[PDB]
Design a protein around this ligand. Structure first.
Ligand SMILES: *Cc1cc2c(cc1C)nc1c(=O)[nH]c(=O)nc-1n2C[C@H](O)[C@H](O)[C@H](O)COP(=O)(O)OP(=O)(O)OC[C@H]1O[C@@H](n2cnc3c(N)ncnc32)[C@H](O)[C@@H]1O
Ligand SMILES: *[C@@H]1O[C@H](CO)[C@@H](O[C@@H]2O[C@H](CO)[C@@H](O)[C@H](O)[C@H]2NC(C)=O)[C@H](O)[C@H]1NC(C)=O
Ligand SMILES: *[C@@H]1O[C@H](CO)[C@@H](O)[C@H](O)[C@H]1NC(C)=O
Ligand SMILES: *[C@@H]1O[C@H](CO)[C@@H](O)[C@H](O)[C@H]1NC(C)=O
Ligand SMILES: *[C@@H]1O[C@H](CO)[C@@H](O)[C@H](O)[C@H]1NC(C)=O
Length: 475
């Protein structure tokens, strides 16, 4: 460690903000949100300004160690701590500047920001919104580089595609601005795989002023129904969602916790009742619903508790997540939906694990996405499907067969997709840590992967940012 320590000790980074394993706070600074993992960094530093980021990077280059920026710490694979052991972790926590350009209605936030503080700042100062993940303390950099999905994404897009530009430090300390029209190759890979290419110092997002002061939420409960009835209900919901629903709806249909759903509507609250009537039309006669209204920012805080708070709503968790997407051209069939429900939630039976999962309705403005325009493949996404196992309360050891148990229940669904000729596709932020390179690369990036590897060779030839297991290799 001597080389890295001595180099860092000659920078201006505070000694109190430079930690190695002999530090009194090492265990705290290296603790992962994803408790199934425990990556061991070479060191963790907290830069106070852009020059200190560059100084830390230069020390990593001189020492021959990899570099991982740490933002909100939410990675489902502990990727911010490097994923693999031995990275220099650059904790971006001080980079929380917030500015608003009222001429262009663009919000600029620092590369170490979290969803809640930044959304709260923009709301309280300007009455504006940008799509964001549904959790108060997730990093904005770490979530925006993997698409993201929020309650407003069916009409506003993803956190990722609402980015207008970013400022990025490359491995050699050079700072560039990336956008669709400036350093487009870098912007391409930021939009899906940013951790493999640079350190995002600042991000600028488009923003939306809500048209209506009041928003609506709702629930749907089918009651005690059999599998065929529940599956038919999903098919009927899907048909409504693909033919009648406006883009301003959101809907989550439970996988674990069936047969129930919930959602939001961001159009005129006086138009909701007629739209909700059309949705519940075919549902079985045991169905009941609820509806409420609240002002826009109150609703935001009900969807993501404590957006304006001071602590994470979601404590660290030992879990294993899997996730697939379906597109508009090949959505659920009766057979594929039945395979999913029959062998995941309806067969789940463990004392040491609990089940979690849902189907988030997509569609809407995913119709405007082109896969050739950014690394992440997500054009015409129609559903986001999440199936997750969580360690039971009171246990501390993830079971040796937990991954196999979770994968087995989700396998009949995959086989039915294969039978129907439907590609297996994923969603970057919902990292499945058990996938092989052959699997994650095509599921996340489709046929963009070769281009991504070329850009990797061009922008990080020495591999400084090659850290976690899903890092983009060079060509
Ligand atoms: C924990 C969690 C995650 C989560 C969620 C709710 C909870 C409780 N809800 C989500 C949702 O509604 N929608 C969605 O799309 N994702 C949701 N997630 C997942 C979350 O978005 C991802 O796990 C995300 O990657 C987490 O980001 P975060 O910033 O919190 O985590 P990290 O470990 O520190 O970093 C993740 C990766 O991003 C790279 N990174 C971070 N900062 C930078 C900068 N400045 N520049 C470049 N790369 C950066 C890290 O290196 C790491 O690879
Ligand atoms: C839907 O909106 C209602 C508000 O109309 C939310 O209701 C709050 O729910 C919390 C649950 O933790 C209760 O403690 C509060 O008493 C409720 N507030 C009011 C004013 O009734 C509800 O949480 C929202 N649900 C979703 C999923 O967004
Ligand atoms: C957060 O915002 C909601 C909605 O305006 C408000 O009811 C609540 O009091 C706020 N919480 C804090 C801690 O300010
Ligand atoms: C659930 O698992 C237990 C063993 O832990 C078993 O006894 C029980 O029959 C199972 N329930 C089923 C298969 O419905
Ligand atoms: C730093 O690396 C980038 C990415 O390869 C390159 O474009 C730039 O010219 C380099 N800066 C130098 C050599 O000063």
């Amino acid at each position: 460690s001597t080389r890295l320590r001595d180099c860092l000790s000659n920078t201006s980074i505070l000694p109190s903000l430079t930690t190695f394993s002999d530090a009194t706070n090492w265990e705290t600074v290296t603790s992962p949100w994803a408790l199934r993992f425990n990556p061991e960094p070479a060191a963790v530093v907290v830069p106070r300004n852009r020059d200190e980021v560059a100084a830390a990077l230069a020390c990593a280059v001189e020492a021959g160690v990899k570099v991982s920026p740490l933002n909100g710490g939410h990675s489902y694979g502990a990727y911010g701590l490097g994923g693999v052991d031995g990275a220099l972790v650059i904790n971006m926590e001080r980079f929380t500047e917030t500015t608003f350009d009222s001429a262009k209605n663009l919000f600029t936030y620092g590369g170490g920001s979290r969803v809640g503080p930044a959304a709260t700042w923009l709301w309280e100062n300007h009455g504006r919104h940008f799509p964001h993940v549904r959790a108060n303390w997730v990093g904005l950099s770490g979530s925006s580089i993997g698409g993201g999905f929020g309650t407003t994404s069916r009409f506003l897009g993803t956190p990722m595609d609402n980015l207008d530009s970013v400022d990025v430090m490359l491995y050699n300390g050079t700072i560039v601005t990336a956008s669709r029209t400036e350093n487009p190759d870098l912007f391409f890979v930021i939009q899906g795989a940013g951790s493999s290419y640079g350190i995002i110092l600042s991000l600028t997002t488009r923003t939306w002023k809500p048209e209506f002061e009041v928003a609506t939420n709702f629930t749907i409960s089918l009651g005690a129904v059999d599998i065929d009835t529940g599956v038919q209900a999903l098919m009927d919901i899907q048909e409504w969602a693909m033919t009648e629903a406006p883009d301003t709806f959101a809907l989550r249909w439970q996988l674990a916790g069936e047969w129930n759903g919930s959602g939001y509507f961001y159009g005129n609250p006086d138009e909701f009742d007629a739209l909700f009537a059309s949705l519940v039309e075919r549902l079985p006669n045991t169905t009941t619903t609820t509806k409420t209204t609240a002002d826009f920012w109150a609703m935001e805080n009900f969807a993501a508790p404590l957006l304006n708070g001071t602590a994470d709503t979601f404590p660290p968790r030992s879990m294993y997540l899997q996730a697939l997407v379906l597109r508009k051209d090949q959505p659920f069939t009766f057979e594929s939906a039945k395979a999913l429900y029959q062998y995941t939630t309806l067969a789940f039976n463990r004392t040491d694990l609990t089940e979690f999962g849902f189907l988030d309705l997509w569609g809407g403005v995913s119709r405007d996405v082109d896969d050739s325009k950014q690394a992440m493949a997500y054009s015409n996404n129609q559903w986001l499907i999440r199936w997750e196992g969580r360690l039971a309360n009171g246990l501390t050891q993830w079971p040796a067969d937990g991954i196999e148990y979770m994968q087995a229940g989700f396998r009949p669904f995959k086989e039915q997709l294969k039978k129907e000729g439907i590609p297996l596709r994923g969603f970057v932020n919902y990292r499945d840590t058990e996938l092989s390179l052959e699997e994650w690369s095509v599921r996340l990036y489709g046929d963009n992967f070769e281009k991504m590897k070329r850009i990797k060779s061009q922008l990080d030839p020495q591999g400084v940012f090659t850290t976690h297991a899903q890092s983009i290799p060079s060509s």
